[model samples]
Target: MNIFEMLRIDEGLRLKIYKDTEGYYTIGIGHLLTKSPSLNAAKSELDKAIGRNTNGVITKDEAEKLFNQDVDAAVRGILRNAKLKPVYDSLDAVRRAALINMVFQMGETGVAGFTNALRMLQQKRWDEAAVNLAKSRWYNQTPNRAKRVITTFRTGTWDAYK
Candidate 1:
C-alpha cells in the first residue's frame, strides 16, 4: 500500500509528507517520531509533523532519517523495477519531481542508475530527456506519478519545460 494508504494519512498529511529540512526537503512522518518525539502524541501531531513540498534539509544528514529506510526502500523499489520506463518519462515536472523525489526517497545511489537520462537532463535536451525518462524502470511503477509525467511529456511542456 502507498504511504497514505499504509498510514491512513489524511489529505493534509499527504500534502505534508515532504518537509523543508535544513535546505533539502526531508520526509515528514518519521521526523515526528524520531527527531521530535512529541509529534507522535496523536494523529493531529502526525499531520502537523509532515511538511509540504520543499527541498529544505533540516540537517546535513541522511534524507532517510525522517522517511526511514523501509518507506524509502519501497518508493525506490517502485522506480527500480524495469517494466515502468515510459510511464515515468511522460511529463517534465513529474519526471523531474520523480527524479528528485526518488533521490530523496532513495538517496543518490538509489537514482544513480539513470546515466542516459542524467546526460539528457544535464545537456538540457528536453526531447531527449523525455525520451530518456521513458526508458527508466520506474516508468509505470507508480501509476499516479507515471500518469502525471505522461501528461507532462505528451503536452510537450516537459521537454520545453517552461
Candidate 2:
C-alpha cells in the first residue's frame, strides 16, 4: 500500500473528535490537537479544517482533508530529520512509507530514538535494522504494526507492509 492507504488503515478514519489511546484529544484520522501549542490555535485550525465546525462531527471530506494535512506534516518532520535525510533518500517507496508511518504515529523524534536501527537502516542492513527494531519499546507497544514496518524494510516492498 502507499503511505496514505497505510495510514488510513492503521490510524483508522474518524469524522469527529476521539480521545486517542494515550488520552490526547484527536480529530479526523488522529490529529492530536492536544499536541498543538494552544487549544485556541488548534481550534481555529479545526474550524478551518471542518469549515464552520459548530458541532462535534465533521464531514468525511473534511476529515480526509485534515488527514492529508497531518500526513504532510509528518512527511515534513521526517524530511527535516538530520539523521534520516540521506538514508530516507536512499530508500524505496515502500521503505519510505515505513519511515513516514513511524513519524506519523510517534513523531520524528520518536523515530530518531531508534539510533541503532536507523544506523542499520543507513547501511542498508535490513536484517540488522529489523533486529534493532525488535529491541525497542515501540516494538513491544505495537508489535503487529512494527512487524509490518520491519518486513517492509527488509523486503523493500509492500508485500508485507499491511
Candidate 3:
C-alpha cells in the first residue's frame, strides 16, 4: 500500500470525534479537529447524527468514506498552493509523507504559517527544517507525532514511526 494508506491504518479508525487520550477531539481515521474551527461543526454534526434523542451512530464504513473525503481536501490544500509547489515537488515519497503528516495534523493554512520551517524545507536544509518544526507550538501540543515527522524529514526514512 501507499504511505498515506499505511498512515491511515496506523492512525486507526474512529467513527466518532471523541476526546483522545491526549484530550484532543479526533475522529474518522485521525482527522483532528482540536484547535480548529471545525470542532464546533463536527460537534454539531455529531449531535445531529447521534444526539440525545437519536439512536444513530457513525458507521465504520461511513468513517472510511469520511476519511477519504477529508484526506483528499487536505492533500489538495497542500498541493494546490503555488508557493509550496517547488518545495513539495523536490521531496521524495518518504519526505513527502512527512509533509503530508504535517498538513494532516494542522490544516494547510496552519502549516503554511510555519514560514521558517517551510523556508528551510524549500532550501533543502533538512536538519534546519526539523529544528524549525520542533520550535513550533505544534511540537509542544503533539510531541510524539511531531517527532515522527521531524525524524522522517531529517532522515527521509519510512521507519520514522517504527
Candidate 4:
C-alpha cells in the first residue's frame, strides 16, 4: 500500500501530504518523514510537480522530466528502489496518466506498476480495464480515491485529461 493509505488520510489532508518549505519538497505523513532530508527541499519538488499537473494534464514523459529536472535524485531513487523499469516501459498514455495521478498522491513508486491494467488497456478491454484499475495496491489502500478515478475512467471523463 502507498503511504497515503498506510496513514489513512482524508481529503482535507491529502493536499497537505507533500510538505513545502524553503524551495524544497518532501512527503510528510505522520512521523514518516522525520528521517527525510531537508523538508523544504522535498516540499519544493512536490510543489513544482503539483503546479505542473494543475496547469494541465502532463504526459508521463513530462512528469518524469519534471522530476528529473527538479528532483531527479528523489524521484529516481524511488523508481530505482521500486525496480519498475518493465512496467514503466510498457504503460501507454492513459494507463500511465492514471498511474502518474496515483504517483502524485502516493509517490513515484506508489502503484504505477500495473501489469494487468497495461494488458487490458493494450487490448482495449474496457471491462478488464475497469477490473484491473480496481485491483491495485492503491485501490486497497485508498478505496475512495480509487473509486473516484475509476469512475472517471468508466464514464469517459478521463479523456482529454488536459
Candidate 5:
C-alpha cells in the first residue's frame, strides 16, 4: 500500500480545522498545532499544499501530506525526550497511544515535566499514575478532559471509567 493509504487508514482525514481528541487545534489528518493557525496562515499552507487557497476545507491528498509531516515531527519529539521514551515504550498499545496523546497536547517538554506521573508510569502503577495526573496543573487547567485521560490511565479505556 502507498503512504497516503496508510495515513488515511491510521489518522483519518479532516477537511477542516477542528479540536483534536485532546482539544488542540488540528486539521488535515491529525496535524496537531500548538494553537489555532491564523486564517491567513492556514490559507497559505493549504494553497501551498493544494496549489490553490481554500475557503477552509482541504482535500484528502492535502491532508495526507500534512499528516506525514506531523507524525514525523511527533515521533522525533517522543524519541528526543529521554524521560518519556522508556515510559512510553513500556506500555501496551492502548496505554502507549494514550501517553502519546498527552505528548501531542502537552508537547514533549510538558510531558517530561510530569515527573511523578512518569515515575508511576515506569512502575506500572496506573492507579497512582492517574492520581498523579489528576493532581497536576494540566489536570487543573482542564478538569473534564483530565478526567478522561486519568480514567484511561486507571482503566485503559474511557468506557470503563466509574
Candidate 6:
C-alpha cells in the first residue's frame, strides 16, 4: 500500500497533453496544466516533455517530481478540508490512503459532498459507506477505480487495489 506506487498504477503518466476524464487539461501523473502556480512551469515542463518525446520529451525524474508534488497537494488538501479532517482522522491507515487517492482524482470539496457517506465512514460502517460511494457520480464516471476504492473501504485492506 505504498501510496506512491498505488497512485502510479491508478493515475499513470503521460508525456503529452491530454484531457482527463474530468476534462482538466492534464499531463504527467495527473498534473493539471491549467491550475495553480509556477513561472507557468507546468506548461514549460509540458512543452519540454513533448519535445523530449519527439527527441528528448519527459524523463522519469521529471515525471516523478510532478507526481510527488501532486501527491503532496492531494494529501494536504484532504487534511485542509476542515469538515473532512476529523473524519479522515477517524479512519484506519488503508482507509486514509483510499481517501488520498480519491482526493487526487477529485478535489477536497468533491469528496466532501458525500455527506452521509462521510458520516458512515467516520463511524466505521464500512459496508454502508461503500454502498453510498458506489451510488455516486464519482463512482459512475470512474467506475473501475471507484470500485477498488469501495472495496478498500469495505475490507480495510489494499487487496482490492489491483
> Which numbered prediction scores highest in TM-score against the true structure?
2
**Model 2 has how many clashing residue pairs?**
0
| Tens-place lDDT digits, model 2, residues 69-136 | 88899888877879767778888778898899888989888888888888889889999889888888
- Candidate order by TM-score, decreasing, is 2, 6, 3, 5, 4, 1
Off by over 4 Å in 1: 1-98, 147-162
In order, how many clashes per candidate? 20, 0, 0, 11, 0, 4
User: 48-153 in candidate 6: lDDT tens per residue?
Assistant: 6445433214666777887888899888888888878988899888888888888888888888888999999989898998898899887889898888888988
* Per-model CA lDDT versus the true structure: 0.43, 0.80, 0.71, 0.46, 0.68, 0.79
Candidate 3 colliding pairs: none
Of candidates 6 and 1, the better by lDDT: 6
Clashing pairs in 2: none
Model 1 agreement with the true structure over 1-162: per-residue lDDT tens digits: 133232222111322324323222324343422333332333344334434223233332333344455455545554675533343444344444444344443345645676776655555566776676666556655444544443453443433222
List of clashing residue pairs for candidate 6: 51-57, 52-56, 52-57, 53-57
RMSD to the hidden true structure, all candidates: 12.8, 2.8, 3.8, 10.7, 5.3, 4.3
Give the 10-residue window scoring lowest on summed lDDT in candidate 4.
Answer: 22-31
| Model 6 segments more than 4 A misplaced | 35-57
Better of 2 and 4 by lDDT: 2
Write the residue-wise lDDT of candidate 5 on 60-156 in tens digits: 7777677667666666788778898888787776566567657655678888888888989888898888887887777887676567666667776
By the TM-score metric, which is better: model 4 or model 5? 5
Candidate 5 lDDT: 0.68
Off by over 4 Å in 2: 35-45, 48-51
RMSD of 5: 5.3
Q: Report how far off residue 82 is in candidate 3 (Å).
A: 2.7
Error of 5 at 4 (Å): 14
